[PDB]
Design a protein around this ligand. Sequence first.
Ligand code: YG3
Length: 501
Amino acid sequence: VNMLVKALEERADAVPDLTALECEGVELTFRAVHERANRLARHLVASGVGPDRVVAVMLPRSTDLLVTLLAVLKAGGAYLALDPEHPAERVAFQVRDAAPVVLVTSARIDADRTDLGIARVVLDDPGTAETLAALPAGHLTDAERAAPAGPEDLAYVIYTSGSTGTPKGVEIPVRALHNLLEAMRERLSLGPGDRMLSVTTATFDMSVPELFLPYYTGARAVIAPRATGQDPRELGDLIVRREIGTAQATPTHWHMLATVSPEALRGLRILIGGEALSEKLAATLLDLGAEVVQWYGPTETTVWSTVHPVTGPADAAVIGKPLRNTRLYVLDEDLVPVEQGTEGELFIAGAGVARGYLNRPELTAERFLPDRFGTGDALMYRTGDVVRMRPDGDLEYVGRADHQVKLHGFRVELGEIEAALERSEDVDQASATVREDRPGDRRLVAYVTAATGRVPDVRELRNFVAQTLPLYMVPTAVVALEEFPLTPNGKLDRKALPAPV
Ligand SMILES: C[C@@H](N)C(=O)NS(=O)(=O)OC[C@H]1O[C@@H](n2cnc3c(N)ncnc32)[C@H](O)[C@@H]1O
């Protein structure tokens, strides 16, 4: 009933001698990747892995990481990716919450980062390496598993970035990850020959396609080394040197790549998603020659749930059409569907919906409602995002249900202000926000970076805006910054923009 592993293995048997991973002039074949992963999967099964059991994984970005995650699935378990640079506490919360059976890790990480209270399977330990390399290396029969793997069995537990709040753990089933990858194979026409770039951190669920989609399709993950993760020059050079057709990043990161490595986007299939895509960015990407495909989706519904090819700068907030076996309801405050063109909160149903939050069963009930247009135990995720349907059936993101109460009797579209600001040649990026620095005095503030070799006069910026937008939308104060604050995932952090006087 685990079609995922059967498909993965069906693929490795049909291209045994192609390359499936490549990292720093090292390549592995499909047969090699799976033999290596099969051996671990047996050793895992001996370490207490079974269906719905969590295998903590703390490994640098490496072929060694991509092999392990594959092993965990083969073992019928579910993986929780830890971060070896994370403070002990971020990692200690996750271990206490998810009760991992075993930690797969490496002996080159400081032994105190891996001293977490779990059993350890350490790949580079002389001995574990001996036992591992000695195990039978064939694909596992279900006899060699702990128990048959169901479609409801967990694939992975990703943890959520709560607004300075208890991190929530999302439980993604196998049928949901299998469904996403199948849709992504179909939308991208991904197969042998094709190279995809694997760069995104494993604790960010946007990585999940970069980790399993090459396995699933017979493409080749070109793993960027850990150092190239933050150097956008080196990534541009890697993209060009190793002829990478497809890569996936947040818009913040795609911006950096254009600023520093314009040539790399020539003939490059960008997958962008995670924040809003400005019209300015969308034009830049297209000017440099990139094929742009936009993906939207909460982590509580796998990774992505909608896709839109961005043909031109108009489409920047068109998040497109639902992926396979996904259903998108845009409903009112009483859970009633709205008429085409009317705004409403986006509810997501179908195969990609998670099982719920991990042992936070109260907040589960508040965000995973019973699927109102489904049956039995089906569930629908309340995204918390407002959308409108255009006549063509495509959807457009409008904003977050919360950040929508009027400012001084008027609805403010904080994107319009940014697009206004981003038309001045002295500005690169703009972010707008409604501030409350003294309670009751809500005010519009906008933030700007500089275009290369220009200085934004932050008073004439208000002039420039005041002739394009309603006066109630002109920011009280504009503020120029050297760089924008970012989240660990490399998204703009609007909660950390400093207040003006
Ligand atoms: C809490 C955290 N673990 C989490 O759930 N992160 S999330 O990114 O998966 O959730 C979705 C959040 O990011 C926004 N978003 C994602 N893609 C977008 C896109 N393509 N266009 C415009 N907005 C996009 C959504 O509107 C919503 O704000």
